[PDB]
Amino acid sequence: DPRETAIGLVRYVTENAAKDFDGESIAAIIYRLRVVENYVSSDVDIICEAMRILIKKLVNLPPITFSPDVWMPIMTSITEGAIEPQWRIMMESIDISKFSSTKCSEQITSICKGFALEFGLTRRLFSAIWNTDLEETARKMMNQEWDSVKIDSSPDSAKQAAGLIEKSIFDLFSEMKDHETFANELYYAALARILNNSRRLQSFYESSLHIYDELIKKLWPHLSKKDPNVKKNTLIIFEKLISLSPTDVLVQRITEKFIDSCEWLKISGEEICTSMEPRLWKIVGSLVSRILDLKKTIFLRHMVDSYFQTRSSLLSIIQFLRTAKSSEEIVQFMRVFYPELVFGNETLITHAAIEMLRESASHHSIKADDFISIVLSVIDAPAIVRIIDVISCIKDEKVRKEAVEKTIIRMANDLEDEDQKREGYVNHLHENGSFWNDIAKYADASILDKAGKRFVEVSVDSMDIRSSVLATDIFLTILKLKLTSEAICNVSYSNIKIDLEKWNKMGNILVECNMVKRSKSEALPLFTIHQLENIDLPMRDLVYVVTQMKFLDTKEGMELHRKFYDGLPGVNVIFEKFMSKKIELCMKLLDEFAKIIAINEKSLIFSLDHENILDWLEEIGVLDSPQITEKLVDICFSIEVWDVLTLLQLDGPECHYWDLQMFGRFWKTSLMDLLDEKMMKKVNEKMGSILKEQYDKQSHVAKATREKRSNGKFPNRPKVADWEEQLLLMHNRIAGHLTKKKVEDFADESTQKFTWLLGVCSGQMSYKKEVAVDAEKILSRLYPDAEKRNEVLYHFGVSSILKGLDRPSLHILFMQIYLDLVQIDSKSWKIDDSVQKLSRRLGGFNEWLMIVDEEKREDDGGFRIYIVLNLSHYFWELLEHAILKIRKFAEVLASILDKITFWPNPKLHAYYYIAQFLEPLETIFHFIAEQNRKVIESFFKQLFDKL
Amino acid sequence: DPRETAIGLVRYVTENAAKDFDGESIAAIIYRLRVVENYVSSDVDIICEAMRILIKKLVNLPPITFSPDVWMPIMTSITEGAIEPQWRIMMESIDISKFSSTKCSEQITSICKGFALEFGLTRRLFSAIWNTDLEETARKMMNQEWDSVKIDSSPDSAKQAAGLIEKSIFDLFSEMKDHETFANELYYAALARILNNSRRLQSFYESSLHIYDELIKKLWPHLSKKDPNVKKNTLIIFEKLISLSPTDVLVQRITEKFIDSCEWLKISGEEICTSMEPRLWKIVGSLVSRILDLKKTIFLRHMVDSYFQTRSSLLSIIQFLRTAKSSEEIVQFMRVFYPELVFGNETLITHAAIEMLRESASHHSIKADDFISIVLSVIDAPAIVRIIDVISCIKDEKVRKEAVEKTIIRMANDLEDEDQKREGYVNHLHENGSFWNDIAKYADASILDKAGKRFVEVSVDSMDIRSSVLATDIFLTILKLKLTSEAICNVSYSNIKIDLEKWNKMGNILVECNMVKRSKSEALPLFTIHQLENIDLPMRDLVYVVTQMKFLDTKEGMELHRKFYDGLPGVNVIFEKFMSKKIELCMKLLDEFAKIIAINEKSLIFSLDHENILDWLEEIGVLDSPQITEKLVDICFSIEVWDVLTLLQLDGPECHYWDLQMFGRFWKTSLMDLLDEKMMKKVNEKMGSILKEQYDKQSHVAKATREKRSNGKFPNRPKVADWEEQLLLMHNRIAGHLTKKKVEDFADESTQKFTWLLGVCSGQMSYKKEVAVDAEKILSRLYPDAEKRNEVLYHFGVSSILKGLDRPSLHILFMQIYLDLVQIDSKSWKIDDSVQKLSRRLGGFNEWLMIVDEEKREDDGGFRIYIVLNLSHYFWELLEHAILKIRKFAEVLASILDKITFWPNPKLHAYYYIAQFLEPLETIFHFIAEQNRKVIESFFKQLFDKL
């Protein structure tokens, strides 16, 4: 029975407790009293005193008594009661004849655990497995003795230690003997393991660092209690362990280990930095090289993970270089590694380096040469956005000023060599307001003056419109830059020392900067002397002057113009001559606006609030000026023809102004109340055919655009966009300036405004019913009688039709409908009518055919003879109410006959129409010949002279 | 920023460390310095001194400062740093204006854990949640103060305690202040919880017992260090807690709890038993009632589990009643609960109760009345197999003797009332040898004598053969029972005092016991005086005497027969008269064996080794006796007819011995070498027809058995079983006893052995070729000449055929073949033959027809006249070599004629055959009539007298 044998062995131990036994026998006794599992509660006490005696004897054994694989199972059995099988294999071979409920067993195990805790077996086990004496190695590395290292640092022993560290006996670390000293010697033995494995290698370090990390994690609360020199010892042990590292990966891992250590042992950055600055610089260089390589590159997922770790390592060491006293070290760091560090697109580390630079500057005055070197090296790099940080790092006012001027010169040079990348960087740098706030609270006045001068120089030297525009805008901002110390004019023209002719070029750039790029509030209107001295300006600065001439009215504008243009002779005379009644400027601006509306061309005036253009002329106060209103009606006329080109779906300036004007006067006006439906059919068909012929004459892109725009063919109006609504709105508003008193302004018959009024009275489409009724009322004021009111309206319509045919598919149609409206009218003639009234109904017929001039004869297509022959031919056909019509026409022809002679041009078939004159003379001689004789003879004489 | 506010609060604490603050403010400060997570390694020291100050102040707070649900999260935060959300909800409502890496946080948490360990916050938390002072309740139950209990024992507080017990602060139980005292007060507070929840209830106890078990599991190593009175306090606390339990389930659970406790606190059975015997008895009664109910019965799987537990509870408490000093208690336990405990079919608990009974008997002398009461109560129960255990428990020799005699009387009474169950129990009890070894080493001689007397009484009084057989066998065993003290005759006939006529009946029971039940070695042959005085015995004890008469030859048998039959007059005369030449016993035994082989009946002689029966007669020495050999040949003859009944597939004694005997002599013997193939066909067909007629006359079971046995019909032999091989083997062996000298024994012609020898010489099938050639050689010795050798063989065959037809479908066939063999033979007759030789060839013809007796005439079927008429008829047909045949037959008939007159019986058609006599007389008178005249006249005179 095993229990009896165990009892006998226990008795043998109790009576032989003062004797010394070989370790093998002790191990055999231990094994045999563990393997028994049928113990009783009665004999537990004697056996526990037995095994405390055995454990006390075992601790006294020399370390070389057993091997680690035999040391392991005995501890297993005496701590948790687990029995390893190969252990029982080895132990059953030992003879012991010379020495001869599970609750009892677990009580025995726990009591043995308590006794093993009291007698401190863990230290003995560690010393045995590691083949070293922990106290001796701890003492020797207290004394820095590294050439006499005697310890096993094999990976499997590290595995065994790690497999130890997790049981519960270490949960009670503050209960074993000299637990602080034992803790210290464990820490130093782990450090000596790292040292041994580092020295041997002169996968290889993973287990060592792992077991060291586990040891420090379990041991931090007790290392700092007894020995206050632990921190310094860790500092020296690593100040070698770093220096013995061959490769950079090793270095970064172990520096991570001491980042951890300084975290555990509560070591602030100041002490470590002041005691390890020399090696730290090398370590920093190697690790930052690793960061650079890993950023360049940025089982294959590790390439990011390690990246993060290494970066965090920097984040720690820079935080340990927070109070780095060596200014030279941090200066050379900024000079060499900071550029690429910024290039790594990492902000935290740069950010901290910046603050430690500012702290080093506050505590110590670094040489200006060093700081200008680092600034230029940063200026050299295409990173010019963060430079302001190191500019704020400049604690010297003079250095700050010189650094700012060097940086501005550098960006000027960057814009000079014309590389897109640098230009983009400069644009981003000038997109923030904190930069300019810092520039204001750093730089002084002279810096602003030189910046303005150089910057106007680059603006005038820049051919690229974008670069010049940016230059002018930022020049405007630096002109209005408020200095904090001085808290405004910052650049004067005299200091620029530039020729005036090139300063004249800046006007367009100023237009672009002040209305295109900038908003209304931040717009800073300025005018170069080319504008202030001339009226013959392009519409760009014409619009500029018209819309920012209110800015000179304010005292601020006049003041800054005077102070900026100070030193230039005659400036006062210029100012008074533009304050003087600019009226010609208004005329030319409105003329250009008229012709630009006449050609269907896009202009930036449309983007402005032109709908209240009448308000604009009210701001200056020339709304009462009469010479403007003429031009005003011109505007109206032109917008009218624009509307026509909108309705025709024609677009483009392929036809002259008068053609489309007379086509506009050709519309729904009461002139076509008299016409019949067959007439409409023929005119619409011919208009559609000629419009289609024009359409297929165009290109494919224009046809696609017109098809997209047009929802329906003639006469349906195409789709309406937005801008035409604005144009129409301001067009109808003109009436605000058309009041012009009661009747006296329009009483002059021979005025363009009178022609406009006659046009608007009857049927102009683009004008709304309110304007139409106002025009009708004012015409009622002019002509109280309605008979003359309609007579003059009809005469105006026909006369406009006739005059429009002077400067040449549409002319022939107009010929046709002129004939046709005459045919319609002829039914309404009275027998008692006069020849002058008939000529008036025919238009300006008498005055039209009496214009005998060389120019009128020149290049005429014979429209006059063509008309005369056409009506004469139709009346001749009728002759071969009707009698009254023929008689009145014959009266008219007899009255006019003596004038038609001068007209026959010598280029057209003059003789053919001379012969064709036979019908009119026949209808005259049917009755009239007796009263009109001299005319007849003179007519014949010039006719024969023509031969 | 929370960190600045926490720093300010920490400063406020440091300058106000000597002031007292309300607990709410302290909790708010704790919460706010926990919630901060951006701490620095620099300020860790000041904050840890801050919270040690706060914890020291908090410990000083009165227990009613907070509620448990507020006490919980603060401990959570200060031990593991986990923050409960509702806690932050409650704490954020407190204003603190008047007081104004995660590695740092975890260091803070671990340092706070260490400080909380040092200041012992766990005791304060327990006192707060349980609304009690642990020291006061521990002291009061040291002083046994139960009427002033003030504690909360709610289930949720138990849940909270259990949820506490598992963190790591309790891993260091030996580090908090007064950890032994705190351990004691925890144990006593848990006990007071059980007490409170037991008293309140005057599901309800599960959490309390669970938390108590967890507490004792974590707290056992420290409860016995300081206070040595813990064991007694647990004893009293349970000596009430058991006594206050209303139901038995509660009782069994809590007694399990103290089985556990005595296991943990190292309390041996002796102390607990001597201090708690009164209540333990009640507890034992209740739990054993539970075991009885659960055995009777033996989510529904629990009915077994609890069962086991409760049984284990008994296994513990009985082991704590090991040294129960009260003999009355254990005696009454055995008297009342032990029977049903045995009935529970559980052996461990009974087993231990038995040993504790023996220990109580060794230490203390229990009254004999108690032990006889418990024995009779066990004897009363049908469990009489284990009684021997309590008989060995009897330490008193006189009591042991009286208990043994009471038990034997009890089993005698059990066998008397004739209930099968009790008989089976007695048989099982007598099936073991340890029981009889114990009976021998316990009882004395007089016990054996009275057992033998009563047991012979029951054997002779038992009508059941099985009960009597068991009685006789066990009487034999108790007769040979060796007593250890006396170390053999144990029962004598005189003491039995039984009448001799009933003792004569025991013979058959002795046969059954000594050859059927018992083996050869343990067979104990005995013979009742009925056998020793008589020869007219049934074959049972005949076989017994023949096979165990060797047992008297040994001195042992004679000695035990004399000493057992001592006191009976004339025993010596009986012994000498059976030692005297038993020869008649042999004759009668062999006669019975012969007739039993003749009827195909199963007998147990077959199971014996009868194959060496010749050896048996050699053992006695009567193998030389001549009067046996006659009977021997009888045996042979009978086995022969048995073989015939085997070959015929007939079986059963439906035909007489002589019929089958003459059919056996009818077989392949040389008598049928003379017969031809048509004769074989007719005889085989008729035999098959009559055999089938016999077959379908039988029943279905016999036909099924015969069909299974017979693999083929006639003449193919059926399948051969085993026993016939044995019978045939001993049959052939007879020859060993047939040597009988050279020629002188068989020289007597008129002997049965001579008939057997004549039969074996020619053709008996069952005898092998060795016996056949031996018989031929011995017949060559008897008859050197071969002519007489074949003549007598032929005469024997025909004479056996004729004699077999005297005591009547097979007879008519025999008639036919007798005629037919005569026809065959008649061709071999010489002209010079004599009438006597011809009669010899015809068989015993002359001697056969001359037997004139009243018995021969009586009931004769007229076979003689039938034969005479049949051959006379065939020879008459031939008459109407042939002449020689007719002449020889006529000579024979003339010689015999004067004798055939006497035979005609008066029951059969006598006159018809008298008339049919005309053919023989005709063939006689064809020639012979002159030499035979007086015969003719006498024949005619008796013929006429017959009329």
Numbering used by the authors:
A (entry chain A), B (entry chain B): 2 to 101, 117 to 218, 229 to 324, 364 to 552, 561 to 654, 657 to 883, 890 to 961, 972 to 1018, ...
Task: List sentences from the manuscript.
Among the >600 human ubiquitin ligases, UBR4 plays a particularly important PQC role, being an essential and conserved E3/E4 ligase found across eukaryotes. Aside from teaming up with various ubiquitin ligases, UBR4 activity is linked to two specific cofactors: calcium-binding protein calmodulin (CALM1) and KCMF1 (13, 16, 17, 20, 21). Our data show that the evolutionarily conserved UBR4 complex forms a megadalton E4 arena, in which inward-facing ZZ-DZB domains of KCMF1 act not as E3 ligases but as substrate receptors. The architecture of the E4 megacomplex is conserved across eukaryotes, but species-specific adaptations allow UBR4 to perform its precisely tuned quality-control function in diverse cellular environments.
To explore structural differences, we determined the cryo-EM structure of CeUBR4. Although the nematode E4 complex preserves the ring shape of the human enzyme, it displays notable adaptations, particularly in the dimerization interfaces that result in different topologies of the ring-shaped arena. Whereas the domains aligning the N-terminal ends exhibit different, unrelated scaffolds, the C-terminal interface is sealed by distinct interaction with the two co-factor proteins. Proteomic analysis of purified CeUBR4 pointed to a distinct substrate preference, with mitochondrial medium-chain acyl-CoA dehydrogenase (ACADM) showing stronger enrichment compared to SSBP1, which is preferred by the human UBR4 complex. In line with this finding, we observed well-defined extra density in the central arena of CeUBR4, closely resembling the elongated shape of an orphaned subunit from the tetrameric ACADM complex. According to the cryo-EM data, the bound substrate not only contacts the ZZ domain but also two long helices in the N-terminal region. These two helices, which are unique to CeUBR4, protrude from the rigid E4 core into the central cavity, exposing a series of hydrophobic residues that may help to recognize and bind the hydrophobic surface characteristic of orphaned subunits. Organism specific variations illustrate this principle: in plants, specificity depends on an internal AtUBR4 ZZ motif, whereas in nematodes two elongated helices at the N-terminus extend into the central cavity to capture substrates, presumably recognizing the hydrophobic surface of orphaned proteins. The functional importance of the ring architecture is emphasized by its conserved shape and dimension in CeUBR4, despite pronounced differences in its helical scaffold and dimerization interfaces.
